[PDB]
Amino acid sequence: SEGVTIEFKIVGLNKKLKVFTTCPHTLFGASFCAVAIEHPIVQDLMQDLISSIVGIYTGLNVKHPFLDKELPLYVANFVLMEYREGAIFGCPAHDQRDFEFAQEYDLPIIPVISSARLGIEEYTNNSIMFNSEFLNGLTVSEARKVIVEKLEEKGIGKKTI
């Protein structure tokens, strides 16, 4: 559904990777990036392990837009190309798809969503973000609103439904 496209700088090549996500507030808990096999970046400047033969590390990282931190870029068979761009960032702590990836390839787990008691959680007092620098202390809905403004003001991302 409605989401946002984020432009990641790749340390390896001149082309920048553009991922689509429905949960931009979890960007600070990102452990890695990953693309499908049929992605332009794969065939452009990179194959024996990919074509013949879970995911494979490209050898290059991507610069995290809001942290002095690099994330490993992967090419996995589980990644779906059809849905939008076919490129995503993995949040192990709040996604079982991304966790099983991080568990196998020893990628770090960073939780960023402090969940509240269930009776009060979803009604109004949405879970509190943390480990997210400026997003700390505010709710998920407020985090998703603010983080999009940071992406748009700095030319990093734009709204896409």
Residue numbers in the entry: 221 to 266, 271 to 277, 287 to 394
Sentences from the paper on this structure:
Here, we report the discovery of potent boron-based compounds that inhibit an unprecedented target of Wolbachia, leucyl-tRNA synthetase (LeuRS), and demonstrate that inhibition of this microbiota target is an efficient approach to arrest the growth of its host. The editing site of LeuRS plays a key role to maintain fidelity in protein translation by hydrolyzing tRNALeu mischarged to noncognate amino acids such as norvaline. Altogether, these experiments show that benzoxaborole inhibitors of Wolbachia LeuRS are prodrugs that, in an enzyme-independent manner, form adducts with adenosine substrates. The adducts then bind with potent nanomolar affinity into the Wolbachia LeuRS editing site and efficiently compete with the physiological substrate norvaline.
To unveil the structural details of the inhibition mechanism of Wolbachia LeuRS by these compounds, we performed crystallization trials with the protein in the presence and absence of inhibitors and AMP. The architecture of Wolbachia LeuRS consists of six antiparallel β strands that form an extended β sheet with four inserted α helices, hence adopting a β1-β2-β3-α1-α2-β4-β5-β6-α3-α4 fold. (B) Crystal structure of Wolbachia LeuRS D1 editing domain shown in cartoon representation with key secondary elements colored as in (A). In addition, the region 313 to 318, which, as judged by the high crystallographic B factors, is highly flexible in the apo-structure, becomes more compact in the complex and makes interactions to the adduct. The new high-resolution crystal structures presented reveal idiosyncratic features at the drug binding pocket, which rationalize the selectivity of these Wolbachia inhibitors.
